[PDB]
Write an enzyme that holds these catalytic residues in place. Structure first.
Site, PDB file in Angstrom:
ATOM      1  N   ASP A   1       0.911  -1.019  -0.298  1.00 32.58           N
ATOM      2  CA  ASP A   1      -0.592  -0.225   0.238  1.00 32.58           C
ATOM      3  C   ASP A   1       0.552   1.358   0.086  1.00 32.58           C
ATOM      4  O   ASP A   1       1.957   1.463   0.454  1.00 32.58           O
ATOM      5  CB  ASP A   1      -1.058  -0.036   0.934  1.00 32.58           C
ATOM      6  CG  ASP A   1      -2.090   1.179   1.520  1.00 32.58           C
ATOM      7  OD1 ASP A   1      -2.882   0.999   0.339  1.00 32.58           O
ATOM      8  OD2 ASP A   1      -1.255   2.225   2.617  1.00 32.58           O
TER       9      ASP A   1
ATOM     10  N   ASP B   1     -13.323  -1.764   1.116  1.00 29.33           N
ATOM     11  CA  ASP B   1     -12.743  -0.862   0.762  1.00 29.33           C
ATOM     12  C   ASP B   1     -13.789  -1.255  -0.850  1.00 29.33           C
ATOM     13  O   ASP B   1     -14.266  -0.609  -1.742  1.00 29.33           O
ATOM     14  CB  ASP B   1     -11.768  -0.784   0.226  1.00 29.33           C
ATOM     15  CG  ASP B   1     -11.130  -0.366   1.002  1.00 29.33           C
ATOM     16  OD1 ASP B   1     -10.567  -1.403   1.926  1.00 29.33           O
ATOM     17  OD2 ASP B   1     -10.252   0.857   0.470  1.00 29.33           O
TER      18      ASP B   1
ATOM     19  N   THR C   1      -4.821   6.040  -4.381  1.00 31.60           N
ATOM     20  CA  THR C   1      -4.266   7.163  -3.486  1.00 31.60           C
ATOM     21  C   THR C   1      -2.765   7.328  -4.471  1.00 31.60           C
ATOM     22  O   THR C   1      -1.700   8.805  -5.114  1.00 31.60           O
ATOM     23  CB  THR C   1      -3.784   7.035  -2.729  1.00 31.60           C
ATOM     24  OG1 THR C   1      -2.855   5.666  -2.456  1.00 31.60           O
ATOM     25  CG2 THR C   1      -5.166   6.978  -1.749  1.00 31.60           C
ATOM     26  N   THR C   2      -2.000   5.896  -4.729  1.00 30.30           N
ATOM     27  CA  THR C   2      -0.401   6.124  -6.042  1.00 30.30           C
ATOM     28  C   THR C   2      -1.052   6.152  -6.858  1.00 30.30           C
ATOM     29  O   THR C   2       0.118   6.969  -7.696  1.00 30.30           O
ATOM     30  CB  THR C   2      -0.353   4.581  -5.340  1.00 30.30           C
ATOM     31  OG1 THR C   2      -1.389   3.613  -6.300  1.00 30.30           O
ATOM     32  CG2 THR C   2      -0.001   4.504  -4.286  1.00 30.30           C
TER      33      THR C   2
END
Length: 505
Positions: free
Chosen positions: A43, A369, A76-77
């Site tokens: 992550d 998620d 996010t990445t």
């Protein structure tokens, strides 16, 4: 000396640390602290918190990343990988006697135009369909490492999000509980239409199974209360502690007896009990429990229509629970209490199973998620094929739009379009294939009248229809990710000095 240059160079160091972690395939680089706790996780946002930073400006890119998780919950990445690409292309123009403001205006013009293109590429799907929801489920679970039986775990999550669709058409993250418990294996997972407590029977004398029982959930400790006014107690004869035991058994017997007169039988205490006290209460067929988590007192109140009670004396029949079937069955070795209510369940709970605590935690970070990305698409009803196919199509249209704008600004709108070619490039290195050798074929599919979905498949390794494979993602993840990346870069471009201010608060 340069100041500004120290920022663009520093921005490229934080991106490389979370660049190869994109897509399913991708190793990780852990940085153990001085303590020595060796931890590994696939992550990006999880590593930025523990990993420290040198310069103060580095925190600007981490602040915008936190909002991408609490809002969307994925990608996010994907926003940081495209950010570092822009900073690497900016220096290419600054050396040509270009002002930074000329580059900032270019991104704002291209970002606003991209919002109108994503809406046209997104397709329309149904809100009650099931086959379409099964594909998105397999895409999120793949991001945690669990391909041994993904086909099965994807079939239980699609049914949960569909059974928690209120009439108004919304999704709540509170009516979907999760419970981890390793025992047999992951194949023992099942969708329960209710709640689940990780407790057992305090004694074996009480009944084992009942039907249509009025549950009475308490939340206190049978002790002497105290008023706001001071009131001390004096003791002088130590020989009174023994006599108090006999006087206490009757106090608890008559107390529990009053609860049975109201039609109840099941109890839930909060502390221990005398060994002989439960004997007189178990022979009369009265179920009871001891020490229960406070978080469970909230879900049982809504599942069985009960309510938390602070005083045992103040108890009404309306606050009593009503369960359809309460049974304490086994679950591979260990046993727990269970309650069923398929007549009209208002919530659901997922029981995760496994062999150890390391495997149950992986799949646990995917169910929370999955309901998010799958719960938002149902409200809006707009999705688009993933796999970077969206960026490949826009990369060709942005070039044509650049011809409309004249002057020294067209150099910026073109760099932003080409900067989106890093997503399909990182996935190529991990797959073991030359990026430049495949990036030339993907453009052939999107020539003119070709389909708008051909991209890349890490499994087979060739351009194929992503819709048939089941690789799609929501539409808000793209608009929100590109919006945050285009706004965060402006913080580093609109600055060229760092005053050494002391005591600023």
């Amino acid at each position: 000396r340069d100041a500004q240059r120290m920022n663009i160079l520093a921005g490229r160091i934080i991106a490389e640390t979370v660049r190869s972690t994109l897509g399913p395939k991708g190793m990780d680089k852990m940085l153990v602290d001085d303590l020595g706790d060796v931890v590994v996780t696939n992550d990006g946002v999880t590593i930025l918190r523990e990993m420290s930073v040198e310069h103060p400006a580095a925190k600007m890119l981490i602040e915008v990343a936190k909002t991408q998780e609490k809002e969307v919950g994925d990608g996010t990445t994907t926003a940081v990988v495209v950010a570092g690409e822009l900073l690497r292309k900016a220096e290419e123009l600054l050396d040509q006697n270009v002002h930074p403001t000329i580059v900032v205006k270019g991104y704002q013009a291209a970002a606003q135009k991209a919002q109108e293109l994503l809406k046209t590429i997104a397709c329309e799907v149904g809100a009650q369909d099931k086959e379409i929801l099964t594909k998105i489920a397999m895409t999120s679970i793949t991001g945690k490492g669990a391909e041994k039986a993904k086909e099965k775990l994807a079939e239980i999550i699609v049914e949960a999000v569909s059974a928690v669709v209120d009439d108004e058409g919304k999704v709540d993250k509170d009516l979907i509980k999760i419970e981890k418990k390793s025992g047999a294996s992951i194949d023992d997972t099942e969708l329960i239409k209710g709640v689940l407590v990780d407790k057992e029977r305090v004694s074996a004398q009480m009944p084992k199974k009942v039907t249509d029982a009025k549950i009475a959930l308490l939340n206190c400790a049978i002790e002497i209360k105290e008023t706001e006014t001071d009131a001390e107690i004096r003791i002088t004869d130590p020989a009174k502690l023994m006599e108090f035991i006999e006087q206490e058994e009757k106090m608890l017997k008559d107390m529990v007896a009053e609860i049975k007169a109201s039609g109840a039988n099941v109890l839930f205490c909060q502390k221990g009990i005398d060994d002989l006290a439960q004997h007189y209460l178990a022979k009369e067929g009265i179920v009871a429990a001891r020490r229960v988590k406070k978080s469970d007192m909230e879900k049982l109140a809504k599942a069985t229509g009960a309510n938390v009670i602070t005083n045992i004396k103040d108890l009404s029949a309306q606050d009593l629970g009503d369960a359809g079937l309460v049974e304490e069955r086994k679950i591979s070795g260990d046993s727990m209490i269970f309650v069923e209510e398929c007549k009209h369940p208002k919530a659901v709970t997922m029981l995760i199973r496994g062999t150890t605590e390391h495997v149950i935690e992986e799949v646990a970070r995917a169910v929370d998620d999955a309901v998010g990305v799958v719960g938002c698409t149902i409200e809006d009803g707009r999705i688009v094929s993933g796999g970077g196919s969206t960026e490949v199509e826009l990369s060709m249209k942005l070039r044509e739009y650049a011809e409309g704008i004249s002057g020294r600004e067209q150099l910026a709108v073109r760099a932003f379009a080409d900067a989106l070619e890093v997503i399909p490039r990182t996935l190529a290195e991990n797959a073991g294939l030359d990026a430049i050798e495949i990036l030339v074929k993907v453009r052939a599919a999107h020539a003119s009248n070709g389909n708008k979905c051909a991209g890349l498949n890490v499994f087979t390794g060739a351009v194929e229809d992503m819709c048939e494979n089941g690789v799609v993602e929501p539409l808000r993840v793209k608009t929100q990710a590109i919006q945050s990346a285009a706004e965060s870069t402006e913080m580093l471009l609109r600055i060229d000095d760092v005053i050494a201010a002391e005591k600023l608060r």
